[PDB]
Amino acid sequence: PPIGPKRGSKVKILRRESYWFKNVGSVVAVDQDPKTRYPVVVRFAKVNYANISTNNYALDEVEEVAA
Amino acid sequence: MALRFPRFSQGLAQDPTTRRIWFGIATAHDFESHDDITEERLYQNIFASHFGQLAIIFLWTSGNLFHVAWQGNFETWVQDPLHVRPIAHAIWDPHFGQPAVEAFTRGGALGPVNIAYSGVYQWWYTIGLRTNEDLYTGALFLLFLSALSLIGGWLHLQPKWKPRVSWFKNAESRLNHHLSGLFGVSSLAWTGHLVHVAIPASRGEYVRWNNFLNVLPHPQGLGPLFTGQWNLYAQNPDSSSHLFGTSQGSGTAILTLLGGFHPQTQSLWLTDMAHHHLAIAILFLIAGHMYRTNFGIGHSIKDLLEAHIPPGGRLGRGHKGLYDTINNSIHFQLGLALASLGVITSLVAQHMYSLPAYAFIAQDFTTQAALYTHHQYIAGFIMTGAFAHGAIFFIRDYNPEQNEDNVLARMLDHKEAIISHLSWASLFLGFHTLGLYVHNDVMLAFGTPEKQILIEPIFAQWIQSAHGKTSYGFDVLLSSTSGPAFNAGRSIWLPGWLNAINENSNSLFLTIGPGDFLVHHAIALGLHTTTLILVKGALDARGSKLMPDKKDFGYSFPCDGPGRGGTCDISAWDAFYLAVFWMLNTIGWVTFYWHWKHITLWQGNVSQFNESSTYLMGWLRDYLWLNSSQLINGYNPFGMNSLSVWAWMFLFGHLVWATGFMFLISWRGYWQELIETLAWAHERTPLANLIRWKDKPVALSIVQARLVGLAHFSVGYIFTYAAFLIASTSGKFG
Amino acid sequence: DISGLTPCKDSKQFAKREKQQIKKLESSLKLYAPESAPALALNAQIEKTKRRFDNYGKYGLLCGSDGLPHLIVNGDQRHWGEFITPGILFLYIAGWIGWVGRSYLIAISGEKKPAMKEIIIDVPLASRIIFRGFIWPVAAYREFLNGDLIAKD
Amino acid sequence: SHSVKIYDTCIGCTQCVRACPTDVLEMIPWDGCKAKQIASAPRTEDCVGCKRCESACPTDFLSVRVYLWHETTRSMGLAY
Amino acid sequence: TPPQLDPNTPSPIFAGSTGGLLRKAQVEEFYVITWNSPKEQIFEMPTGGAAIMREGPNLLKLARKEQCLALGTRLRSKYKITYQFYRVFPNGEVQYLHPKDGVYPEKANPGREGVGLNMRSIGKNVSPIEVKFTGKQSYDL
Amino acid sequence: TFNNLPSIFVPLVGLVFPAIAMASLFLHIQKNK
Amino acid sequence: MRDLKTYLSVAPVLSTLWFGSLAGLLIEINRLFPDALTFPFF
Amino acid sequence: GPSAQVVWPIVGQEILNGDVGGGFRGIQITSGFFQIWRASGITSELQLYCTAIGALVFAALMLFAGWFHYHKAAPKLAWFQDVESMLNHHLAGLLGLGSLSWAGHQV
Ligand code: CLA
Ligand code: CLA
Ligand code: CLA
Ligand code: CLA
Ligand code: CLA
Ligand SMILES: CC1=C(/C=C/C(C)=C/C=C/C(C)=C/C=C/C=C(C)/C=C/C=C(C)/C=C/C2=C(C)CCCC2(C)C)C(C)(C)CCC1
Ligand SMILES: CC1=C(/C=C/C(C)=C/C=C/C(C)=C/C=C/C=C(C)/C=C/C=C(C)/C=C/C2=C(C)CCCC2(C)C)C(C)(C)CCC1
Ligand code: SF4
Ligand code: SF4
């Protein structure tokens, strides 16, 4: 079974140290390897201070938004 | 611990560069960051350092007393005080030219001298201390107290008396003793002085240590106190004709509550201050016996904080767990302490000018200005330090898992709201204060001062009218005779208070106007903006979206690199450092306002301030340009006068205020790449290859250079304004 | 007569300020021919000054010892026209602006790249949104009651 | 001298090492990312502190992380 | 891999500059870079100026590691040659420095170990109160 | 000789004591145990 | 004109047009009602 | 006082029109343009007006020249890189004949 969210599921972030903390994002892809610690690649509408719109997040550092 | 000079830090000792010297100077008193440190040793070093500071305080006061006793005209000043100049100390400068010796000879002195603008003359004369031998005795006693504090600080570093970590954390017994004894018994003892000495000294006779056991401060003597007939201590209030220092018009009362000022000295009554210190002595001795120490009664501050959780959770977990984040954290203790100290220092400044306690201190005008400026700049600095130490607490000492959801973590939960609404209030105040000031600048520019926006401060005039000031016709609680406030106090203190406040010549509740409104809103802008910077650095001390790991970098660190757009001045230290600029600006505003209002009151033309304080070219022309004439003419090509030192200090403060701009504007990288060329030149210059540094000469570090620029900046700010405020107020003296 | 201020139609210092400014203008009016254009501009400024002082007389402005119109912003009805009747007229207009620029930002919030409408303003969309803020106070009121004024994160 | 500690959020892009002007960093094999490599930091004693490694780290905040610490002649960028 | 054993190879043609080894070589470590240039060509050396590196082996002694690695990256990116530099202490003991495995550090060679590596996200570091009155910091657990 | 005491102490604290302190603290700055 | 209305839609061109119109409005109001310090119209 | 700027009487800024002299209320300028115009022998506002129209003509001319020399017919690098001609022309023609024609005006 494919682990994590889907390749178009909307998600929000519970990572304290992220720029998009408590901000929603779009799951690009989830690495199905059970050895990558941060498989959930998320895409965000607004860039961070490094002019980057995406980062890999963990499964527990993420929350499938109900919208 | 280490090898080279920073023995307290083997990271700077193992630094080949000159940064070792600087950082070992700076981080010397940061005991929390030293090597091989324990909470026990930290507390013990703090205790011994407090002893050292008390020793230096008593030594500095002994020096004041000695240099007024030896080189002062204090015996001549107590004869005709309001027409004889104080003398701080003598001067032996071998660079002085003979004109400068002719000029600095003041106060009827054998040589050149310095005028005590500090008020120690007035204060010492008010508390007794008539002859110079009394000041000599005081200096000897304070030398003894300095040696006693040094003895205590050395003794409480030895193992037999090194107090334990759990003894400095006894936060109930310490409050009990300090409220009861340090605050209460000390106020009680000052009442004892004011009653046995200072009141008899004001009323003639000189009650000294040889003859104080056989003179009665009150002719009955402890009958009234023990019998409860305390009104007998308010029988003869030396009403309205008493000459301070002589028995003409004197009285017998020692604790009469009169309110208002002496008629002669325009200071408060020593009976009033005796009764005052007695009353707060009772209140502090009562408030002391509150916290449980050893005896099975009293409160535990824990179960007061733990119990103050509101149902409904509007605060959250309340103060549940806040005893531990203050008792175990010395930076919270220091932040609260400096907060209270800055508040009460500002209070000292704001009350000592309007309710002067010392004899003939309202009559010498430079003294009041120097004192208000001093205590307000001290208060602004102490407030900036309160906040800086709150930031250092949030970084070093704050444990979020110990204080989850309590009243302190809820700060960081919504820190953006606090910071953004402070950023609203300051922005509103600046936009509108500056807009009105610029509107009035342009109206006076276009020759239409009637078009000015002169918003009357109705809400402060209403408070003045709630205190008996019959200058606005509001007819409020104490300006109205038919009121409960003008009935329950009309027999006790409102006579003197009304007759003091209604006098337009004193500083008690000055008649204000629209310039006072505008400058009060400039003051509010300064306070709100300094608060914004400091609170923002304190709450973003642990981290932000730009640097969430800031807590791992400590309080003072330069930056986080050019990445992520750029992280210059991101530390909480940098917030402090920018807030010192905004603080000095704020206190410059409050003290410009004070000094111009008061120099216009003392001159006589209050209309000058009232018509000229509403537009900024009035502050530049009629205050800075006008009052600085006698200052900058302290030394002209054809001679000099006594204000030559203040002109020189004025220009000196300008020079260092400008030199701070070198370190603030010009940053590192240019200087390291300059000193590389200098090092090349020294290593290739003949007859100087012989000489070689032992410390590799690097440029100043970044955060260091922000500090050094801030130090030059503040030194120049302070020296410039001290020179201008003393020279202008001493060139004419009202 | 609040705050110890005489009215400006009765204040002698106000009339003295008027006469001083008028004499200052007339001393500059003597240097020009009475029919010339600088002289006519100075005379127009003189009538402007005179009717300015008359209008500050009739509109209930209070003048202090310095003799300048002070504004009583406390809430006295006699002086609402000094602060509150303009102030509401500010909070309306200001709240027009913010209710427009906010609404616009909500109308271009659901675009693909909504930043290229921040720098390149849709004039049709902005003109449709601008007059929505005419009666903005009821929209802001209802959006506060409906919760649409505050985002829920 | 300095302390260049890295964290497991690294994705193995090899930009922190390609920016490093002092060879502090080097990619090692690892199993925690799609690229199967992570950036170690053996030569921390050669670190000047320029933070080019973390001005090139494309994570949400950072994976490589320079903590400035005891400054030696190698870390003070001194050719003399 | 075994190091490359710095020989007494020749140096570039340079007329001398004020960017050399002042005192960090006399009493402290200085550095030396060796590169095999296929042809003789001009290059901007990091101590200011412009030198002409010879054909075959070249050797340039520099004052710090950043000069060596800056020159090396410019060589590897512009002239595409393979550089390798050392560190020579004033008593000897030439230390092989740059590749340390034969292959450049951007390539994940096996054998090199994980040093300076935390198995946690960056914001799971404990607070300074946890490591207070301890020689450890908040990033070394 | 009490108007001569400033002439004794102002150099002794201002020239001599600064030389003493600067020399001693420069030695303490460069010491190595 | 296509792509001129997009340029005139740009933030500085649009800001200068809006503030020129607005400043002319304020300027002509102050010509009509000069030297105003109260709102007496109620 | 040399004055060549008048303000509009709107918000009391009309007092910036000072008694500079000559039956004129304006801002005393400091560009020394009046001194240039006396050095040129102007002596009439018609001449200043027509050289203003001429300078507007030359502004339109330079704007059209920039449009032409970017968008319609632009030089290539062989035109700029030759500098002997650029110097010869900017010396003999711009600065040489420029000073010659100014000397002709003056004479
Ligand atoms: C009644 C007993 C008693 C008394 C008198 C004191 C007294 C003191 N303790 Mg405490 N202490 C006690 C019991 C007591 N302690 C106990 C039982 C413990 C164990 C729990 C401690 C533990 C303890 C620690 C750990 C420390 C002290 C410290 C101090 C000193 C405070 C510094 C200072 O000068 O503040 C002076 C401040 C005031 C008098 C308050 C004045 C504030 C008012 C509101 C200002 C306005 C009026 C102003 C005075 C007028 C000025 C006019 C003119 C005269 C200039 C002071 C000597 C500190 C210290 O310095 O160590 C040496 C310190 O570090 N104590
Ligand atoms: C005269 C100098 C000056 C001025 C005007 C300000 C102004 C301000 N500072 Mg301070 N600041 C200064 C010097 C100054 N600073 C210095 C020397 C330092 C030390 C580095 C700091 C450090 C500092 C910090 C650390 C912080 C501030 C903050 C602020 C803002 C406070 C809110 C406020 O009053 O806004 C009201 C607005 C003004 C006073 C701006 C004045 C300009 C007018 C009103 C705008 C319109 C002008 C004009 C029409 C534009 C046309 C020109 C052009 C387009 C052609 C504001 C922008 C705080 C902040 O920004 O948070 C809110 C803050 O946190 N400043
Ligand atoms: C060339 C300029 C110059 C110099 C060198 C001096 C020198 C002096 N003047 Mg000044 N003076 C000058 C120009 C100068 N004057 C001019 C132009 C005027 C205007 C007419 C005056 C007006 C003037 C007055 C009015 C007075 C002096 C006084 C003094 C003496 C200070 C006593 C002393 O050394 O205490 C010790 C010095 C200090 C405490 C100040 C130094 C503070 C340091 C920098 C801060 C601390 C740093 C750190 C903790 C310690 C590091 C050093 C360490 C190694 C010891 C001293 C001889 C005073 C005097 O003679 O009274 C005794 C005095 O009252 N002067
Ligand atoms: C923030 C501070 C501040 C404040 C409060 C003021 C306030 C004022 N200034 Mg000052 N001024 C300021 C800053 C400030 N200024 C600054 C910074 C400068 C320098 C740039 C000036 C320079 C200046 C000059 C030189 C002059 C003023 C003048 C004025 C007055 C404006 C009269 C006017 O034309 O408005 C009239 C009202 C408007 C223009 C608003 C009209 C808005 C439109 C038409 C919409 C309203 C209708 C709307 C549809 C709602 C209707 C309700 C319903 C039917 C829908 C007023 C007292 C003038 C004056 O009279 O002096 C006292 C004047 O000559 N000011
Ligand atoms: C808006 C008011 C205004 C205007 C339009 C002018 C215009 C002029 N003045 Mg006058 N002047 C003014 C105000 C003004 N001045 C004031 C307040 C004073 C002080 C009393 C003077 C004093 C004065 C003197 C003494 C002299 C002039 C002269 C001149 C002329 C030459 C200067 C020139 O071309 O500027 C060129 C200036 C620049 C290119 C600098 C940059 C300015 C930029 C373009 C402003 C852009 C503003 C924009 C609308 C808004 C912000 C844009 C955005 C970036 C945010 C010109 C006719 C001279 C002359 O010979 O007159 C015939 C002369 O000698 N003026
Ligand atoms: C950062 C931080 C910190 C610091 C902070 C600060 C520094 C603060 C400050 C603060 C302040 C500085 C405050 C103040 C306040 C004040 C108030 C709050 C007031 C009140 C008042 C009242 C209430 C009054 C009343 C009255 C009157 C009106 C008069 C007469 C009498 C009576 C009584 C009636 C800490 C450490 C804490 C912690 C951490 C964080
Ligand atoms: C002010 C101005 C203006 C105007 C100006 C002008 C008008 C100018 C002119 C100019 C001119 C009008 C010029 C001319 C020139 C000429 C020349 C430069 C000539 C030369 C000649 C020669 C060189 C010769 C030779 C010869 C001879 C000798 C003889 C015969 C033969 C021959 C021909 C060969 C304008 C509007 C623009 C505007 C701006 C300013
Ligand atoms: S730059 Fe960051 S993500 Fe890329 S290899 Fe280095 S540590 Fe990993
Ligand atoms: S700070 Fe500079 S030298 Fe240190 S690891 Fe990062 S890139 Fe390399």
Chain G contacts to C (CB-CB under 8 A): 5-6, 8-11, 14, 34-35, 37-40, 42
3-state class of H28 per DSSP?
Answer: strand
How many angstroms separate the Cα of B483 from the Cα of each of B100, B158, B459, B466, B470? 61, 64, 20, 11, 15
Q: What is the side-by-side strand order in the sheet with H3-5?
A: H3-5, H25-28, H18-19
3-state class of A62 per DSSP?
Answer: strand
Structure tokens at C123: 């004039």
Query: Could you tell me which chain D residue has the CA closest to the CA of B698?
Result: D76
CA atoms within 13 A on the CB side of B204: 11
Considering the four listed CATH numbers 3.20.20.140, 2.30.30.50, 1.10.10.10, 3.40.50.300, the one that applies to the domain covering A3-67 is 2.30.30.50
Q: CA B713 to CA B105: how far, in whole Å?
A: 32
Q: Which of B169, B177, B344, B345, when mutated, tests ligand 1's pocket best, judged by the most ligand atoms within 8 Å of its CB?
A: B177
Q: Which residues of D are annotated as a binding site for [4Fe-4S] cluster?
A: 10, 13, 16, 20, 47, 50, 53, 57
Interface test with A, best of E121, E125, E126, E127 (most A CBs within 10 A): E121
Does G9 sit within 8 Å of C122, measured CB to CB? yes
Helix (H) or strand (E) holding E95: strand E92-96
Instruction: Report the interhelical angle of B270-288 vs B186-193 (nearest 10°).
Output: 160
Quick one: how far is CA H66 from the chain centroid? 18
Residues in H 2-31 with any Cβ partner in C closer than 8 A:
9, 14, 17, 19, 23-25
Q: Does the annotation place B595 within a ligand binding site?
A: no
Q: How many CB atoms lie within 10 A of CB B454?
A: 29
Which of D28, D25, D18 minimizes the C-alpha distance to D45? Answer: D25
Structure tokens at B185: 């018994």
C-alpha R_g of chain B: 29
Nearest CA to ligand 4 atom 30: G36
Q: Does the annotation place B29 within a ligand binding site?
A: no
Chain C environment of H23 (Cβ under 8 Å): 32-33, 36, 38
Structure tokens at A58: 């963990």
| Minimal C-alpha gap between D60 and chain A (Å) | 5
Alpha helices in H19-92 (DSSP H): 33-39, 45-67, 77-80, 84-89
CA angle (B577 as vertex; B573, B583 as ends), nearest 5: 130
CA atoms within 13 A on the CB side of A33: 12
Q: CA B256 to CA C18: how far, in whole Å?
A: 54
Which of B460, B476, B706, B679 minimizes the C-alpha distance to B574? Answer: B706
B107: left (phi over 0), alpha (psi -120 to 50) or beta: left
C-alpha R_g of chain H: 21
Structure tokens at E113: 């170990």
Q: Give chain F's end-to-end CA distance (angstroms, integer).
A: 47
What residues have CB less than 8 Å from D49, skipping those under 6 apart?
D2, D66, D68, D75
- Resolution value (Å, 1 decimal): 3.2
Residue whose structure tokens are 């201390």:
B129
CB-CB: which of E18, E128, E130 is closest to B395?
A: E128
Residue whose structure tokens are 């040589």:
B111
Which of B517, B636, B532 minimizes the C-alpha distance to B576? Answer: B532
Q: CA B50 to CA B45: how far, in whole Å?
A: 9
CA H98–ligand 7 middle distance (angstroms): 7
3-state class of A27 per DSSP?
Answer: strand
Indicate the DSSP class of residue B230: G
CB-CB: which of B447, B458, B611 is closest to C3?
A: B458
In B119-274, DSSP assigns E strands to none
Query: Which residues on neighbouring strands pair with residue E84, listed in sequence order?
Result: E34
Q: CA A57 to CA A19: how far, in whole Å?
A: 12
CA B538–ligand 2 middle distance (angstroms): 21
Residue whose structure tokens are 């710095």:
E6
Query: Which residues on neighbouring strands pair with residue D3, listed in sequence order?
Result: D67
Which of B17, B330, B26 minimizes the C-alpha distance to B9? Answer: B26
Does D8 sit within 8 Å of A17, measured CB to CB? no
CB-CB: which of D51, D61, D76 is closest to B561?
A: D51
Does H12 sit within 8 Å of G31, measured CB to CB? no
Q: CA B661 to CA B384: how far, in whole Å?
A: 21
Backbone angles phi, psi at B398, to 5 degrees: -85, 130
Which letter, b or e, does each residue of B587-597 get, where b requires 16 or more Cβ atoms within 10 Å of its Cβ?
Answer: bbbbbbbbbbb
Domain spans of chain A, in order of start: 3-67
* Contact criterion met (CB below 8 Å) for B563 and D51: yes
What residues have CB less than 8 Å from B306, skipping those under 6 apart?
B319, B320, B321, B323
CA B395–ligand 8 middle distance (angstroms): 27
* Contact criterion met (CB below 8 Å) for B560 and B413: no
Q: CA B448 to CA B453: how far, in whole Å?
A: 11
* Contact criterion met (CB below 8 Å) for B549 and E125: yes
Q: CA B106 to CA B99: how far, in whole Å?
A: 13
Q: Which ligand is nearest to the CA of B635?
A: 3
* Contact criterion met (CB below 8 Å) for D26 and E100: yes
Residue whose structure tokens are 């530099």:
E85
Q: CA B210 to CA B191: how far, in whole Å?
A: 19
Beta strands C69-71 and C62-63 are antiparallel
In B583-701, DSSP assigns E strands to 635-636, 639-640
* C42 CB within 8 Å of a chain H CB: yes
Ligand 5 atom showing the smallest separation from residue H28 Cα: 25
* Contact criterion met (CB below 8 Å) for E85 and E47: no
Chain breaks in chain B (C to N over 2.5 A) after: none
C-alpha R_g of chain F: 14
CA angle (B166 as vertex; B165, B172 as ends), nearest 5: 130
Which of E22, E82, E76, E23 minimizes the C-alpha distance to E57? Answer: E82
Interface test with F, best of B1, B4, B67, B132 (most F CBs within 10 A): B4
* Contact criterion met (CB below 8 Å) for H36 and H2: no
Could you tell me if the CB of D22 is within 6 A of ligand 9?
yes
Q: Which ligand is nearest to the CA of C85?
A: 4
Q: CA B456 to CA C62: how far, in whole Å?
A: 10
How many angstroms separate the Cα of B395 from the Cα of each of B288, B388, D48? 33, 11, 26
Which of B23, B44, B15 minimizes the C-alpha distance to B554? Answer: B23
3-state class of E37 per DSSP?
Answer: strand
Backbone angles phi, psi at B639, to 5 degrees: 115, -170
Helix (H) or strand (E) holding A55: strand A54-57
Q: Which ligand is nearest to the CA of B193?
A: 1
Chain G environment of H10 (Cβ under 8 Å): 27, 30-31, 34
Query: Which residues on neighbouring strands pair with residue H27, listed in sequence order?
Result: H5
Q: Which ligand is nearest to the CA of H29?
A: 5
Q: CA B519 to CA B588: how far, in whole Å?
A: 11
Chain breaks in chain A (C to N over 2.5 A) after: none
Which CB contacts under 8 angstroms, 24+ apart, belong to H20-24? H23/C32, H23/C33, H23/C36, H23/C38, H24/C38
* Contact criterion met (CB below 8 Å) for A35 and D32: yes
C-alpha R_g of chain A: 11
Q: CA B338 to CA B388: how far, in whole Å?
A: 10
What residues have CB less than 8 Å from B556, skipping those under 6 apart?
B571, B573, B703
Instruction: Give the number of B-F residue pairs with CB atoms closer than 8 Å.
Output: 22
Nearest CA to ligand 2 atom 23: B578
Q: Does the annotation place B654 within a ligand binding site?
A: yes
Which amino acid would we find at residue D41?
A: A
Residue whose structure tokens are 């600087």:
B22
Which of E83, E82, E81, E86 minimizes the C-alpha distance to E97? Answer: E86
> What approach was used to elucidate this structure?
cryo-EM
C-alpha R_g of chain G: 16
Burial of B290 (0-12, 13-18, 19+ CB in 10 A): middle
Quick one: three-class SS letters along chain C?
CHHHCEECCCCHHHHHHHHHHHHHHHHHHCCCCCCCHHHHHHHHHHHHHHHHHHHHHHCCCEECCCCCEEECCCCCHHHHHHHHHHHHHHHHHHHHHHHHHHHHHHHCCCCCCHHHHCCECCHHHHHHHHHHHCCCHHHHHHHHHHCCCCCCC
Chain C environment of G33 (Cβ under 8 Å): none
Q: CA B330 to CA B705: how far, in whole Å?
A: 27
Interface test with B, best of D6, D48, D55 (most B CBs within 10 A): D55
What residues have CB less than 8 Å from G38, skipping those under 6 apart?
C56, C59, C60, C61, C81, C82, C86
Q: Does the annotation place B670 within a ligand binding site?
A: yes
* Contact criterion met (CB below 8 Å) for B274 and B294: no
